[PDB]
Amino acid sequence: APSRNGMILKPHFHKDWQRRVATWFNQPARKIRRRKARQAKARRIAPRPASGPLRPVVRCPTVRYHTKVRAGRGFSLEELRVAGIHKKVARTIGISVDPRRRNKCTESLQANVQRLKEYRSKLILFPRKPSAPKKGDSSAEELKLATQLTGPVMPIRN
Amino acid sequence: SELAGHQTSAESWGTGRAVARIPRVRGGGTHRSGQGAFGNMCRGGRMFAPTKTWRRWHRRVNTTQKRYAICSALAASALPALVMSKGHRIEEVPELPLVVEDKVESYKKTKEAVLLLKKLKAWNDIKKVYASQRMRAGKGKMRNRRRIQRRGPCIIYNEDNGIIKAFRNIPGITLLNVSKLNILKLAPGGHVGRFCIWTESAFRKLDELYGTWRKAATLKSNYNLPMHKMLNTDLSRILKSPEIQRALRAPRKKIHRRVLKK
Amino acid sequence: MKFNPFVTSDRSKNRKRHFNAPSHIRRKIMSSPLSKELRQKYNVRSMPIRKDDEVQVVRGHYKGQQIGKVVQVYRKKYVIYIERVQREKANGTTVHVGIHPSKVVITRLKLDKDRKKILERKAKSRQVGKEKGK
RNA sequence: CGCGACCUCAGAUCAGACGUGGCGACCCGCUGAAUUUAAGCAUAUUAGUCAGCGGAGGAGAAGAAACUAACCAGGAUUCCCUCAGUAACGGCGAGUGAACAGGGAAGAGCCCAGCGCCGAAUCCCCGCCCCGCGGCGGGGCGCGGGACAUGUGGCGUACGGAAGACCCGCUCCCCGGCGCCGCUCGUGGGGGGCCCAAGUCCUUCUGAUCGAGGCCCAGCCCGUGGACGGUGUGAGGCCGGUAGCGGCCCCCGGCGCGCCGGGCCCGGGUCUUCCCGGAGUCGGGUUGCUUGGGAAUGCAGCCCAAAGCGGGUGGUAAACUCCAUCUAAGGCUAAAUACCGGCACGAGACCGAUAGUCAACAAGUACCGUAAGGGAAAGUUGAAAAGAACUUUGAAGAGAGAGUUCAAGAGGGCGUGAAACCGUUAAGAGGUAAACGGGUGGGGUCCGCGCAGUCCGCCCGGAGGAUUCAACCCGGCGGCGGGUCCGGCCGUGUCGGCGGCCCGGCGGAUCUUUCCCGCGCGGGGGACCGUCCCCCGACCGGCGACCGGCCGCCGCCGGGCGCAUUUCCA
RNA sequence: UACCCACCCGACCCGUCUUGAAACACGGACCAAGGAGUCUAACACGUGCGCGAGUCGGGGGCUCGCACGAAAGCCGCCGUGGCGCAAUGAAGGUGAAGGCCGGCGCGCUCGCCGGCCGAGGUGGGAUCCCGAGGCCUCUCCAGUCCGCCGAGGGCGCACCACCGGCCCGUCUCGCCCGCCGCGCCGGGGAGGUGGAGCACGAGCGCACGUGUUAGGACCCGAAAGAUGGUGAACUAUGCCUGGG
RNA sequence: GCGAAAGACUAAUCGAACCAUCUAGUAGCUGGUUCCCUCCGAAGUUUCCCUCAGGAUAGCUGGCGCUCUCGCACACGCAGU
RNA sequence: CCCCCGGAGCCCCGCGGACGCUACGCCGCGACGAGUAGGAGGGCCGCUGCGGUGAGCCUUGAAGCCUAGGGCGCGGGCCCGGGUGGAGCCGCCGCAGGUGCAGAUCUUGGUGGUAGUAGCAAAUAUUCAAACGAGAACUUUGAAGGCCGAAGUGGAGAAGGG
RNA sequence: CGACUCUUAGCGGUGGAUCACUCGGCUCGUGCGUCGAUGAAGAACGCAGCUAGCUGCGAGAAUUAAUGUGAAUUGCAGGACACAUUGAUCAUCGACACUUCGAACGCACUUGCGGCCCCGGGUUCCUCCCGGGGCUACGCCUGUCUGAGCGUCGCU
Ligand SMILES: [Mg+2]
Ligand SMILES: [Mg+2]
Ligand SMILES: [Mg+2]
Ligand SMILES: [Mg+2]
Ligand SMILES: [Mg+2]
Ligand SMILES: [Mg+2]
Ligand SMILES: [Mg+2]
Ligand SMILES: [Mg+2]
Ligand SMILES: [Mg+2]
Ligand SMILES: [Mg+2]
Ligand SMILES: [Mg+2]
Ligand SMILES: [Mg+2]
Ligand SMILES: [Mg+2]
Ligand SMILES: [Mg+2]
Ligand SMILES: [Mg+2]
Ligand SMILES: [Mg+2]
Ligand SMILES: [Mg+2]
Ligand SMILES: [Mg+2]
Ligand SMILES: [Mg+2]
Ligand SMILES: [Mg+2]
Ligand SMILES: [Mg+2]
Ligand SMILES: [Mg+2]
Ligand SMILES: [Mg+2]
Ligand SMILES: [Mg+2]
Ligand SMILES: [Mg+2]
Ligand SMILES: [Mg+2]
Ligand SMILES: [Mg+2]
Ligand SMILES: [Mg+2]
Ligand SMILES: [Mg+2]
Ligand SMILES: [Mg+2]
Ligand SMILES: [Mg+2]
Ligand SMILES: [Mg+2]
Ligand SMILES: [Mg+2]
Ligand SMILES: [Mg+2]
Ligand SMILES: [Mg+2]
Ligand SMILES: [Mg+2]
Ligand SMILES: [Mg+2]
Ligand SMILES: [Mg+2]
Ligand SMILES: [Mg+2]
Ligand SMILES: [Mg+2]
Ligand SMILES: [Mg+2]
Ligand SMILES: [Mg+2]
Ligand SMILES: [Mg+2]
Ligand SMILES: [Mg+2]
Predict the structure, then answer these.
(1) 113-142 of B, contacting C, C-beta below 8 A
(2) How many C-beta neighbours within 10 Å does residue B158 have?
(3) Which nt has its C1' nearest the CA of B259?
(4) Is there a contact between C61 and C110 (Cβ–Cβ < 8 Å)?
(5) CA B102 to CA B199: how far, in whole Å?
(6) Nucleotide closest in space to B124 (CA vs C1')
(7) C10 has a chain B CB within 8 A of its CB
(8) Contact C89, C95 (CB under 8 A)
(9) What beta strand segments (E) does A17-59 contain?
(10) Which residues surround ligand 2, an ion (CB under 5 A)?
(11) Are B157 and B105 in contact (CB under 8 A)?
(12) Residue A91 class from Cβ within 10 Å (0-12 exposed, 13-18 middle, 19+ buried)?
């Protein structure tokens, strides 16, 4: 029974909110459950970027959002034959492969290629064995670091 | 519980039977059979509006509100008036924003700590705590909340280099990091002005923590101290400046008992 | 303060873990201190009381210096039963009266294979803590 | 009128496996209302909810697009925020009512069938040995079985792959054992056991202390321990404990080297030849449920039923027509994600025994109903049974003494022990039922007193009696106030130093890539403005911000002053 | 003041529904204990506090075995967004700006070009400023200081009333066009009207009061409806088998 | 369901059982709604209602307020006149 | 000349100010204070919980309970006198409620009046003596009177009962 | 003062409020995520020196062996033992056990009926009979044996 100026209100509580209410007194213990994963995963994979693999620069879709940029899913395929990285190798080298992106422009292609070219250069390939041959980066470039990258690898700033 | 007194299967034999029209319990050769169930009014039964879990237990403050709550608590951690007037037994203390060497972060034994609190003449707050230990009045006693006591001096330190261990067993003392101050603990009870012991390391970090005034915090993102609503807080000086007194009508204080008419 | 969660601190829960603890544990609980002589000689503060151990009452109605020997141990009533520690009933039939370990002091331990090794191992732990603190 | 292959199909208490019930919060299929709501009412909603039913696991489902989009594009799932209570639906009304983009948790990808390539390269079950045996497995050897040619292995699967040619560079994984070395985060992984400070010090309360003063710094000790519980009252110290990369002993977990037995000739990049999608499926017509999906979102039955530059999609039917984007008909999967059931814990602004769960206890117990089912009441002696020995009355129940108890006016349904209610003792009343309001009076129990309540406090005058002073200086100490802002230190406003400016930073899409580093961009440096510091100089608020001297005054202490003073007393 | 008693005056038993209850209306023997406006979401106004054309809050992150801790702190997060920062139209979309001056186009109250000022005015408008004139002041005059009074005049917020203006919709009317393009192209005027508009801002966040709903919903209070189950031990029938 | 037929009977139950759940079912309708004091203080009137036991809006009420005046020798306004 | 209050000696004192000035304190004027529903305000009115704080109180006796023990508020209640009780409790400043009962044929438990009231009425039936026993109308034995009256109150079974 | 009655008081009960405790709830978190035909969940009955109930257990029954632990146990008895000893007790549990129903399994549920294997006595397989041990429920998979079919053939 309305009285003198309000809104209409179709509050939707005619069903049964009561039974299916989730309260959130997990929230903070969950915060911590999470903490211990972030934590543990890093200590397990010791030298490896804690955040996760390298992930591509990418443009947001719909018209409003245009001007932004993101970590995309993974770098395209077309992208790799160009950087000279085999797609199945990339996946082992902490390089994120989406294989499902239609690459339409040379602008965002080379932009995103430069990230791989950049990655190669500042990547210490820790060798199969200790007494190991080619492509693994030398015992100097090896001693210097035990360094997990905290935060997103080569973070994408607009 | 959601089932509180609500597990009964009682119809209510309403009207024509004297009784009362409550829902009354079925069959039986017990006594609990034709009692009443699901009435607030009745045994077994249940309350008004079962106290539910999704009560809005917790609450809310704006960052700025609760930053300059700390300001006001800290500013009154000077001013022996307010600090004493919490019964913080500061009389033989040398000075009030009480700063101490940064040797203190490194005591690792309660005996050292205790010898500091003598030599800063600050026993007698802990002493006081130490006399105020009794059994809580009420029902809390039978719930993990039996004893109680005063608060003792707050002690603050930019880095636990062993200190918090030392000042722990001493009753009343709470440690607070400077980087992580807390209004609950600086201003307990929502009253202002607790006795605090800055250690030089910490005491420097206060302006860089959360600002001087004509300078950013440089440790919080954007935060600067609250401005005052007025500068000359004493008005008694104001009220007998010659500026004011000159421009005032002369009093009226004959008073004026009313006149009985004859 | 306690800390270790994985321990209780609950008015009720360790009130409970009292008059429901098994005889296994009640030994440790039913311990009394040693007299200065032994506490010196042996480097052990307090011992589990045992059936034939000699004991001085310290608190209670009938405190004294009389070294009586322990007779038996209600670990059920969870209380010990000593020698001239006793009262006369209405009929003359003397009955002993209960006392804790905690309100009593050991003046002569009754030694053994199994009890010696505890006295060694407690005294070894004491000194390991003092050598660790050193 | 035989024997033999196969195909179909039986029988075996055959050899070996396995399935079935329960649990059921969470999980998945389906099924499925009506109260209720709409002020009725059937449309709608409750609501794909409850019951019903079916099904799983430590989580369940889903999942590697027949997606999203309309961007300059993104890129499996789920989840949280967000969209957003929005697009639409609706006797367009009650309600209903999602999605697309972004941010974030987490984040992993992959496998079939076919086309083909490869002496089935395969697979199953026996027998003998070699190792292995408390999740039955490797190694070998056997014209020991059998499936499989209606098709078993490898590569391969669309993000290309196969096959060829020559372009480049070069060779370590897997598994059965069998050892051994580093016990491998709460701050030595899991579990168990076992273990690690300090007073029963004085005195004094008390039945008993754990209480109150004290005790070489709030007393003594300890204090990486002062949580808690026990302990004839409130106990850091008595005891268990607590804290404490505190100790040690088993076991269990997991990860590191060796030996061995087996398995494996597994790359990378270029030019050509060809080779490709899963049918009664898509789609359509229809009907039925569903959502929000719509001139059809989803799911159904039936009817009709495809193609191969095709098919779906690209959200008001449709033709034409242009563009985008996936690729179904086969399939798997951690992670976040859910958890009123279980085991095991931790806590609380909680309830505190007519509350709190039905249940603090013989609680799902007693009892009821034939049965489905229904389903209670009921905690407390004391500290210790020390629970009345013994005399006596009484058939006995009960008493009186006595005894025990700090307390039995704590006596076995015992802390306390209300009111209704009843028990008797004392006082007073009593023909209009009691009971009530206003006003007095009498009497009591008590309560103040007074064996004068003459209540106190100044000042003064008088008369007695008694100490050292007050007034004064002088020595000291400590305040206060004043100013000369005298001298210095302090800060407000102004000016000067352009002096910090690079030895002062940080902010700014300010400017230079004349610079440097890394790849036009990023980082760094250099210029600019706004900001915040030094030097010194000048003015002014000269400010509670002092500190030094000079002053003026006060107070205290110590000297002097012996008595017409200055106190005390009556 | 309270207990009993005494008197004098007063005097119906409460609760409730009720035009009207002592009711010849209903509840109510007495006493103990229990017992009824609760929580959440959403609005709305009122108010409190923070910051302010912003402001937030999460959800996320970074910082704990929590003793206190499931706290507090902090984050180009800090804004990916909400709310606000602008409306109007069904929709394509448009979008708050006027004055003045000079010059140029015939100032044609039409078009364009240079400068100046910038939210138009009127009436009320707390009101701040100016203020003629008093009004003293031991003498006559002179005169600076100082207040009180002060007719009269000026700026005028907030607000109210009005008159003006600009954006969008729609109408009417009527002018000139630009010309990446051709105008069934786009574009510009005048007047009127519709708009929950702009016309030099007030929101955001967080409290609390009230209220209104949605919620079981202040508690108690039906006849019903639905879904699943148990019963022929009574009785009703049928049947089977016994007895009189 | 069962009825030689009477709405008989279905275990003290029948115009159609009992048990549990949906279940706080709904109720314009009965009843009640728990501490003091101070101040102001109604209506049973308006139009629409599947409205006549109820709602909708007219009123009247309180609260919250605000804009001002001037009783500070120096007031305009309002009004059951 | 017409001089300085650290002194005019003060009803005016402007050189410095109540005892009074909890600056939401206190003081003087006037004026006014019928109330259901409702609002609003005020409640050192009341209940239970926590953060503060009260060198709070407490085995030299708390809560409750009880009091023809003194009082105070208008009153919510509050404060004081004694006894008993035996373990804990309160005051202020805040915060938090499942928050204050006479009512609901309200819920549970208890208790009255009624009231020592209704009532112990279906089958004709008992009496004596002894025993036993503390105690006998009620048990037993004897004796006597009676009934059921073989379609039984006789003697055996089913189902049920256990 | 006669008795009753009412009020109040002084005490006696009745009742069980109030208060004060609390081995229980409730709520909220965390860790793990535990069945079975080898025979579960659920029930029946039995088991102690004196034991009705709860609880614990299973004819090997108020437990079994073992390892810690390390002297009790106890309402009362009674006990071994040698407390210089698996050594009392308790916890753990890992060694062994598992009465009857039950998905309940030979068929039915009376508690009766059987079948088929073994080993005692009986026999001296002579068959019962008496004694003892193992199997025997339905579905279905891989395999095996035995088959059926005017199904399709082949050879005769
Ligand atoms: Mg991440
Ligand atoms: Mg309840
Ligand atoms: Mg209380
Ligand atoms: Mg199953
Ligand atoms: Mg209705
Ligand atoms: Mg309806
Ligand atoms: Mg209806
Ligand atoms: Mg419907
Ligand atoms: Mg539906
Ligand atoms: Mg719906
Ligand atoms: Mg269901
Ligand atoms: Mg998606
Ligand atoms: Mg203690
Ligand atoms: Mg204690
Ligand atoms: Mg100890
Ligand atoms: Mg389909
Ligand atoms: Mg629907
Ligand atoms: Mg697929
Ligand atoms: Mg799957
Ligand atoms: Mg799965
Ligand atoms: Mg009870
Ligand atoms: Mg209960
Ligand atoms: Mg009791
Ligand atoms: Mg009681
Ligand atoms: Mg007593
Ligand atoms: Mg007592
Ligand atoms: Mg007690
Ligand atoms: Mg009693
Ligand atoms: Mg009486
Ligand atoms: Mg009398
Ligand atoms: Mg009515
Ligand atoms: Mg009448
Ligand atoms: Mg009535
Ligand atoms: Mg919105
Ligand atoms: Mg109906
Ligand atoms: Mg009829
Ligand atoms: Mg009034
Ligand atoms: Mg509460
Ligand atoms: Mg009550
Ligand atoms: Mg006859
Ligand atoms: Mg017979
Ligand atoms: Mg009771
Ligand atoms: Mg009680
Ligand atoms: Mg044949």
Answers:
(1) 141-142
(2) 20
(3) G29
(4) no
(5) 6
(6) D218
(7) yes
(8) yes
(9) 57-59
(10) B 5
(11) yes
(12) middle
